[PDB]
From Swiss-Prot, chains B, C:
Entry protein name: Ribonuclease PH
UniProt function note: Phosphorolytic 3'-5' exoribonuclease that plays an important role in tRNA 3'-end maturation. Removes nucleotide residues following the 3'-CCA terminus of tRNAs; can also add nucleotides to the ends of RNA molecules by using nucleoside diphosphates as substrates, but this may not be physiologically important. Probably plays a role in initiation of 16S rRNA degradation (leading to ribosome degradation) during starvation.
Keyword Phosphoprotein: no
SUPFAM superfamilies recorded: Ribonuclease PH domain 2-like, Ribosomal protein S5 domain 2-like
Family: Belongs to the RNase PH family.
EC numbers: 2.7.7.56
Superkingdom per UniProt: Bacteria
Record: residues binding phosphate: 80, 118-120
GO CC list: plasma membrane
UniProt GO BP: rRNA catabolic process; rRNA processing; tRNA processing
UniProtKB/Swiss-Prot annotation, chain D:
Binding site for phosphate: 83, 121-123
Reaction(s) this enzyme catalyzes, per UniProt: tRNA(n+1) + phosphate = tRNA(n) + a ribonucleoside 5'-diphosphate
Record organism: Mycobacterium tuberculosis (strain ATCC 25618 / H37Rv)
Gene that produces this protein: rph
This enzyme's EC code(s): 2.7.7.56
Domain of life: Bacteria
Enzyme class: transferase
Protein name: Ribonuclease PH
Subunit structure, interactors included: Homohexameric ring arranged as a trimer of dimers.
PROSITE patterns: RIBONUCLEASE_PH
């Protein structure tokens, strides 16, 4: 067994809390084990066909050692930009921006604690926030079509650690992985993206297929967790 | 007769203090003043630029009623951010013996998850508890030059004149109509630390100041008790 | 009994106010608090971004005893700068009826030519005189909805506990020793705008606060007089 | 052949590799994928910014006039675009996968990829060209006797864009094809039959796993041509005067 | 003889290649010996804040210098040298163009140094003019010109200074660093001056020296103007509108 | 005819006020007509052979219409950097940095009011400040050479306005000059730089002769003004 007592194919405990804050149309605190990310979906009137932007960031204290605030430093880190763009791509893949009307949805993912898999947790939670924002826009009757979402989005890290394929890697496993990867998938039997291979690793087709098989199994578990959380009543006051 | 949320003029919104909200920081405190939520962390490092303490305040884009642009993306800190950041630094350093801490550095981070008025005062109140936990952590690791670095407790609350009445801890609703606004920082040893941030366009008589101070200082006593209650619990994590 | 510059605890440094120091701005005021020299200007423009006023404070690199780095060259505004800039803007707006001004904008610039303590209080005191000249200018150009946009006068002074004594208008040396010190922003009507904390962070008794306010408000009276004397002269324009 | 430039779906644009385009850097390669043009240089430095292993960094930029309509300089805006940082990081990650930094010794190689003309596939061209520049930088260091081992390079790196355009799977997409593709991505591979990365590009889309397999098939088939083009160019004499 | 193999009045081999890239209306790779600069002219309709306008920007690729230099976009700011040279280029090119005759169109000039071995800004100006000409040719063929001949003269520039007690033109990096005094001279094919600038660090000069420097510089520009005409005599290498 | 009643070859009234502020070693308020520039020279304990650096900036209200503060914009204008570099290069031409101590002299030129010829005023004033800074340093025994200054620096603007050559152009003339430039010279019969200004224009060789003749005549007057002001005692003293 792993360090956290998990089996190789097991996700960490996933906790999805809708309406963690009240101002955003969507506000979801998602936890993959000790990894905690607050994902919000803010709605505005007027695009700059609707639009969806995505921004990812980590609180200075989220990491084991405190990192400098990017605002203080005066610039975004490369990693930040990389992840933000991944999230933006991932979410747009399952939303019909024409059915959204000329609206703008700003996705914000702020990591409160980082113990590996922060970008995949962020994507998984961001989708729930997006669902709530859409529910909100629907109530306020601002959607060109009642169902802009064509599929659900989830994501999970996967890699070879200690000679074995494992899913949802915490910090310690990730730093030890001979090959690692982030998989974004839909509940409608399709892929959205495979992202961010670990530094210095090259993989064979067979290895890719096995990594995908693992990740897709785990994603199914994520879709269910999302469905369970979304089955509850909207945590706020509908327009 | 009563405020929009049913409160009396002297009553604080419900106060919730959760220590060990995250594991990595030596101190991690989620504090809530009603709907206002601020994550307050205290990170510990060795060396300095006596020890030092620095503080940074920030608001998540979605914390406000309408999303605000991320400062890192905009490429600069807003004036509000530097004002409040410096306030927190001054306030906290007021009750620490940096000479009795070692050549260590405590970085205070206050990140607003939801803004509903009084974020900077909640931030200060929560930051003190985080600091206290950072001091406990340092103590266990045998890093202190003196066993008791903290010389007093810090707390803070907003006060103002809304509807011609002197009220404490203003939400956004009240704070937007306040005839006069401000933030008071005080110690649990009867002393003051700072009075700050008068509402836009607001002026106030000397006599009004004294009533505002009376009220604020009353609420702070409630805050110090809440802090003590929270700090009574065991350290919420693994200790060196 | 006597301070380094031969002053009593309650005495202000010699105050000099020179209007029309430059000709381009509607208001151009060189104010001096002893050795502290601040050029305060008021620029008038078309419309807002009810009129609006903004304020910006900055120190010339050579103003400080040891040359400080130019902010433009550094690539960022210091926190102290934004903090003071905001205070100046708010203070002035507290004694203007923007409606009486009509859609219009007054840009306040306070640039320190020489810093010897109390640069921000000098900047506020001088800025008001520049603002008055800006109003005078706008009136002559017949761009004012109301002839009397100014509802009161604004001045400010530093005060603190130095060498165990309550003292007003602290120079650089006294400021660095100050056990406690602050900037009091007052109106000539009899109200307060702000009491800005400044140090690294300190605690003071409420009775001490009352003393500090008492002396500070007295010194401001002297400042309001200096403002009137200067403003009693003819507009150094450049009349429209 | 229903492609704007006359190509079949599986065909690469004409590839031109010119080594020693400039003479100051240890490696300097102008690479062309049809009308796309990228200058890929490799500058060598003594030491590293601590264990005993060298380092390789990568930066990618587009000249203002490279795009169809002039774009503003990032230096003038005072900010790096997310696109720039994204590509810069991928290039460095891709090249490091085939270089033994220990066997390299404590030397640092700086890869710079500047787009002179942009007509799609600029980051895949950048990667493909950067490897040749890297190889030349290694030849330089080898001759100067600054290597802990004579052969730090364990494989060759190339990349090509692939996607679904006009309902067909196509490789090496120009500007116009890329801007209308249902699905598109950049495949980075080695010449040892392994994958380095599959970089998603564009607005965002979903694709069946069977489609991915087809995309990889054609992309990897195109990379073989790229690997041969790199070989043929490197078979020429070193354009500079090895120490 | 110089370490170059050149005489004191000799320019390094000059190469001008029009249509190096296809996207810009004008695109010229110019080489003063080992110095290589890509000079582009991008046509835009309309005007900034405004007669038409011309802007100029100069930059060096990190590897252009002997030791790789930091990318300005990564630094987070332009260097003073960059803005100094960018402005010099803008003034120089606008001096020989009638922006009225150009209509309300904007020409953006970009000079990116691929390899630096002295005289990069002068090479940039010389190559930029050729690109400007091609841009004017483009606009004409499109018809978006108020007057068929907005160019009133040809612009060229060269470096010159006193090295080892002798006056020389087109200084490489080598001589550039040993120069008692050196500067950049921009001139027209009419024989008039456009600008003299960038005196070497810590150097002063008598008017008699300045006159010697200018005479030398003007001679060299004659050669440059010939090179420009030769290159511009070839057909437009792009695909006219 | 010229607006202010000046002939073509004469300067606006020049006023030089040393010790305008006390903190810096050299502090000079110089005025060319209505142009006012505060030129200071600050000393330091080292360098980056001594060193001299210069910075020029304009107060927002210095111009007819307020200009944006550069620190607020977040970047230096090209004009600012162009002039800063010119000023530092000019002053360095007449000082033996080796003769100077192992110290730096930071030159700051801040324009209080701009009515044309700010940069030539800045240079002309900056030298006087530099002089006082040298006086200060030698009086502190922190100089290696009793006389680091090998010459005096002064500058004036010259151009063609209304078809005729004129010296020291105010704003109204500068904004309509066909040809325009700034001449930096020494008091020892040499030149330092001829900085082109304006939008850009050509001028004949013989025109350059006329421009320099008139400009160099004006500079002599400036050299006089500098001498007279430096003839007065140093305000402050240092044993």
């Amino acid at each position: 067994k792993r360090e956290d007592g998990r089996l190789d194919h097991e996700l960490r405990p996933v906790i999805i809390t809708r309406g963690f804050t009240e101002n955003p149309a969507g506000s979801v605190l998602i936890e993959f084990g000790h990894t905690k990310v607050l994902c919000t979906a803010s709605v505005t009137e007027g695009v700059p066909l609707g639009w969806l932007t995505a921004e990812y960031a980590m609180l200075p204290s989220a990491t084991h050692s405190r990192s400098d605030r990017e605002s203080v430093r005066g610039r975004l880190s490369g990693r930040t930009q990389e992840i933000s763009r991944l999230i933006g791509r991932s979410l747009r893949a399952c939303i019909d921006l024409a059915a959204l009307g000329e609206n703008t949805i700003a996705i914000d993912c702020d990591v409160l604690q980082a113990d590996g898999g922060t970008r995949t947790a962020a994507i998984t939670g961001a989708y729930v926030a997006l669902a709530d924002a859409v529910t909100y826009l629907s109530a306020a009757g601002k959607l060109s079509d009642p169902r802009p979402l064509s599929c659900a989005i989830a994501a999970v890290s996967v890699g070879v650690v200690d000679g074995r394929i494992r899913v949802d890697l915490p910090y310690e496993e990730d730093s030890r992985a001979e090959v690692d990867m982030n998989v974004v998938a839909t509940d409608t039997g399709t892929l959205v993206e495979i992202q961010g291979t670990g530094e210095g690793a090259t993989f064979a087709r067979s290895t890719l297929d096995k990594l995908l098989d693992m990740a897709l199994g785990a994603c199914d578990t994520l879709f269910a967790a999302q469905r369970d959380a979304l089955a509850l009543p909207y945590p706020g006051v509908l327009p």
